[PDB]
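[job 0412] stage=fold_complex status=start
inputs:
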Amino acid sequence: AAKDVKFGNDARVKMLRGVNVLADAVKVTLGPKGRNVVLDKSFGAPTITKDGVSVAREIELEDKFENMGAQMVKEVASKANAAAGDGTTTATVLAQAIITEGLKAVAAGMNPMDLKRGIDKAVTAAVEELKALSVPCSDSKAIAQVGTISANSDETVGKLIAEAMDKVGKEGVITVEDGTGLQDELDVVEGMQFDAGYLSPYFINKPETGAVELESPFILLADKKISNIREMLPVLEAVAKAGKPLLIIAEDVEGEALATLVVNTMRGIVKVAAVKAPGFGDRRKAMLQDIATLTGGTVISEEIGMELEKATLEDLGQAKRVVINKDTTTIIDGVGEEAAIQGRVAQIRQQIEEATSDYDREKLQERVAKLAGGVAVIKVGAATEVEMKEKKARVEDALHATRAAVEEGVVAGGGVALIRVASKLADLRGQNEDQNVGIKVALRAMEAPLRQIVLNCGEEPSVVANTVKGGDGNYGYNAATEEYGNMIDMGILDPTKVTRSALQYAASVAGLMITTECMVTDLP
Amino acid sequence: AAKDVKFGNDARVKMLRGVNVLADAVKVTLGPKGRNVVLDKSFGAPTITKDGVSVAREIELEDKFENMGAQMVKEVASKANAAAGDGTTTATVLAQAIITEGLKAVAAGMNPMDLKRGIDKAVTAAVEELKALSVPCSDSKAIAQVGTISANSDETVGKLIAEAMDKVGKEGVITVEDGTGLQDELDVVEGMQFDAGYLSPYFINKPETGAVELESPFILLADKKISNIREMLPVLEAVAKAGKPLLIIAEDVEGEALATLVVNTMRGIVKVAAVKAPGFGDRRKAMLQDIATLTGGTVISEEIGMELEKATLEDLGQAKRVVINKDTTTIIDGVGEEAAIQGRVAQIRQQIEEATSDYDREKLQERVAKLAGGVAVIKVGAATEVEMKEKKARVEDALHATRAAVEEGVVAGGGVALIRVASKLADLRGQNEDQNVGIKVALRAMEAPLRQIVLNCGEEPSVVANTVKGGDGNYGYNAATEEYGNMIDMGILDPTKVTRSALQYAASVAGLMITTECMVTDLP
Amino acid sequence: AAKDVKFGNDARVKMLRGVNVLADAVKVTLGPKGRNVVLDKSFGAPTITKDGVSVAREIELEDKFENMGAQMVKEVASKANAAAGDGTTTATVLAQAIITEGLKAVAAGMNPMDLKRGIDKAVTAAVEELKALSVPCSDSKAIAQVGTISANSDETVGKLIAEAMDKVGKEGVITVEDGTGLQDELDVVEGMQFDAGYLSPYFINKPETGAVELESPFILLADKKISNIREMLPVLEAVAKAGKPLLIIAEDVEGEALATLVVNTMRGIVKVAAVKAPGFGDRRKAMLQDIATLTGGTVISEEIGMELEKATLEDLGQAKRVVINKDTTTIIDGVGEEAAIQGRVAQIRQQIEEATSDYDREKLQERVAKLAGGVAVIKVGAATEVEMKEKKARVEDALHATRAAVEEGVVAGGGVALIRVASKLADLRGQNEDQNVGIKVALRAMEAPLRQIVLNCGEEPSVVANTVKGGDGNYGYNAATEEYGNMIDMGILDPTKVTRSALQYAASVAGLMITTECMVTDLP
Amino acid sequence: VAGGGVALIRVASKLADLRGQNEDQNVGIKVALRAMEAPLRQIVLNCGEEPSVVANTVKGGDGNYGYNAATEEYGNMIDMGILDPTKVTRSALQYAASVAGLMITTECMVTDLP
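[job 0412] stage=fold_complex status=done
writing structure:
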């Protein structure tokens, strides 16, 4: 329909104003002296929260252009949180800093594409320097230490995490669920994890973790695109009877079928989810098959002449739990026979001896690792149901932290790593003075989270920032205790991955916005 | 009374808008393709003019703040025309280039005071480079070429000026007056020119050159400050009788006496002008006495006990002509007997011998220079009164220009000198990035005059500018003939003094405006 | 006070709308079928008029810009009437056509200066062409013919003007005055006409012709500038008591004295008028003396030491009538002895023999022509006073027409010479396509008077115009008779001077407006 | 042909002497010639350079000489790897001029009421 179309400075200030509302709303929550945000709800009492991700979720603006701004950086920053388990809020205040001074510089008549180049140069630089600051977390004493810090100095969580990683490997799949008792349990069950996200942001029944969670679900495995719910109806109804939920895995799910699944599971008739079967070509078919073996189900392909209408509940797979993210699907405790599964692992494992191609061999190795390796399950013990659910959420958080730490290490928390790393790049230069400005802009922006934190405390950010800049390595300001020192020793730290991811995603969306000349939107 | 006070950005945009009205009105007249500005008059038919000084005079804005800006660059710019006899328009469009980009920078958060220091650096640099580019004007051939060119290719005027200078020297006083008839006269008469300005405007009966002109006046010499016109009455009413005008020379003319003199001569009775006695302290008295000897009048000092009341008509000296500029008073053909005059020069020239200091020697030598050197007078003829006044005007112009050219040289006209000189400064740096921006701001500003000229010419200013940059020396674009080449050979040139004056004053008021944070005016 | 400043397109359309009101009001009177305009008067009945000069005189506009426009083309076109005795209405509609199509071009992006250049070239060409077209008017038969035509086919007026032009020459001074009744007298008297204009309006007692008229005046001749009414009082009161008017001729009359003359004669006390002494330099004194000898008056000069205070009535010169234009003084029947006059003539005439150069010779001959030639006087006979002032008017008009006819000749009237001459220039070109458009613009503009004339007739302009273009020489359309043919034979013709003047002046003001970029006026 | 806009401006620079049957037609020709410089100019402007200047320098050259905006370097565009298939440059021009012609010769427009 008819559009409102804005160009140049006109468009850029609308964007600025929008992300300014987003970031200003979200950054009051940052750090240990972080303040509270009140989020209304139609039914009942308001929400009082310090979780900036919760806040961001709620921010939508009435100006169409301002809203585009806020929604843009919203979507780019949630990627930080999806990749590292954290950093979305951070990414947002960085983005706001880079955009603010970036556009200041644009309006001053400097060249956007060069400002963006300078910025991206400083960010590449900074990420190398981050890799230089990063303390390795490799042996399980260190895994335990980081788990502990992210559980709030609770050593039991560090211990638990470390035990699970000891069972299934640093690489392994680990989940948390409610306990059987006052004591913790750790059990490895047959299971898999692979990259398939929800095909719709709906299906989400656990909005906290942005997760789809299904208990004792049916699993449909079909190699085909499904564009019409017509094919589906006999099976769907077969499921409505059985009164358990349904996971769909196919080459894709499009149009009518997808919309009808959005609507039907919004209305309560047969709660269903859908994910894109991983890979393409013959590997897609193989991976589909592996999941079939794992869940005791059977695959439906047209290539053998099978059809979706002729499907029954017997062809369906089943597991105790499935969990589906933005980007990932996890199948926990499938039903399939250990003979069939181990047999299948054998097939694959021999296929690996026979493999003439490096790529074939790697891919086969991925498949077996997933199949043989299974899933570790942490069952959290506590005295009360509340001490329990509290511990359990602490352990999920610690789990994401620990994993990120194993991959890329830890660095000074409290936004000091960024300000440190920035301080090392003062003599960095680009091709022309515009690019140079781009660099100094990104560098000043890397001081924003520390400054925000400090401000929330009440102290002067200019002074604290200047002091931290004065020092070396992991020297910084512990905002909790208002005391300077070594941040890693004081147990204030971020996984190197979340700091890196925050910086990069911020820098991405800021770069795009700076180089935007035109915004087109619907009419009010 | 109640004030309106604006701060920072608010103030700076109001100023900016002001100087943009001024410059944009004035600058359409720039160069050979310059357009016409139409200035309304209360009584009669409108004025159509390409003279930018005349346009600026009429410019006053309704918004008090905007108006402050306009008037600021107006008053500083006028000083160019005052020092070198041309270049006020140039200074205005330069000031607009500098202010526009400078404020642009200030809103980007660069430091105003650093911007200013960088700008002033560029200006100093460019004045040096300008001195290097200047081609000397010394021998009468060159003098006559410059005259001829400022006379609109009239070789008679160039020849005439070169001849007048040939009689009285390069340092010589030269005046022009109406002609007795056809052809031309050149005559050396006794007279002097000293630095004293008019003590009020509104004295001006010749608004086209902005000067007071009095013919066969009585010259009153008084050493004192005259604060009361009660002392003046016998003298004013004494000169009313004779039918002649009156020139007041005093230590000053202040307050009541000055307001009553301004009004009394503004009503058309006893035409009078007032100027300060040249110098200060003792040599002021000395000078007033040298003038006493020149005019055949007598000085009144309160020391010896003489009063203004007891002064009669013989006490006053009389000359054939007096001409009063902004800063200069020149007196032509006085009664004072050659016995008197030669006597005075003998006294002073013997004073020079006994001089212990170089300073005294040179001061007295300046007194005998002014007194003995005398005055060259050009009587400009024509066939009619019309052609006579016109050619007289072109002579006045060409004379000022040749004065200037003798002093500091000549450089390429059409604003190519500025753009050349700015091509040579690309490597000039300051103490910090902000100063560097200041520098580049000024250097880019220096392309404005040429660019305007080309624009008014129909052509593409960026292209011309670029071509000129790519060359060297007094190479430039001749805008009238659309042909590139040595500007001096093609007879397009400016006295270096006026180009210099223009850049310096433009930058002066610009730097002040960039460093202005607050404006205060009466309430609307 | 604060000004309103309009630029570029805004400015240009304001101007346009102005000259459209002026021209559209004025041009409905053009040609034989011309319409009536009604001009309101404060008291009583309105004026109804077909005279476009009147209509023009009344046109003033509310919008200060639009008014600026109207008053520009109004003041320039009035110059046409002023030089040729006709053409001001023409000049206005011509200027409207040029300005209209011209700005249309300016707003399509063509170069105003180039457009102007092309227009001026076309006009130059057209003026040559027009000189070629011109049929001479030399013999007295022809003179009488032209006067008869301009008198509304009154053969009497032609005969009269022809007899007068034979009395004093075709270069001679001819005055027309009230008659002794029902007889046409022609008499040659001692008398002079020279260039000096009234020094001030408000001297004017005949607002119709815009001229000063004085009967039995005293003539004061003084060589000096009079800025002070002090010296005048004895003679002003001597003439006061005499009950006769007074005319001042001096080097100038300035300031206090001119203002006092204005007011004192504005009050009905002792009518006085003043003009500059004709010529400049040394010649001014001899010419002044000539006027003295002619009027039997005596020159008062400071040279010999005379003062005005000691001047009596016998030193005063005398004529029967003096008449003062904007630019011209005519002295009719001076009383000076025919002896004195004749001997001054003798002296000048020998000064012509003693003269060294051609210049001196031709200026002297100017003097003796004025002095010796005298002034022809036409006393207009009629039966009643209405017929008398009416026929006097027709004779004044015819006399102007025949003077112009004698100087430059006559060309086809009714606006056909302009279109003829345009049709001959079809192949004219300039430097560039913008200049060419300029040329075509003026050429098409030259079709405007004819077309308008035709329009006032109720006929189709394009048809008659196209027909006239398809013809040769003095072939055209007679509007009155609706019939084609040789315009000269048909008796429809203009003096070449006026058609020339109109075109030249209209292209002047039009070229100014087209190249006008900025307008400045007071705030409403 | 040369990409990055320079084929169009090249070709335009060759047609300077081209005339039609009348002055209106002539203006038309110059209009399309001048319009043929718009893509190069826009490209340059997106870079931050002075379109007038780049364009003029390109007209000064011959054949597939042009300006590579990526690298700020003048030279042969084909050698430099910047090029358009001749079909698309020709098509773009012809379709542009078709719609533009239609629009110029449109005197009346008819649409629904708000």
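[job 0412] summary: Chain C touches chain B through 41 residues (CB under 8 Å).
[job 0412] exit 0
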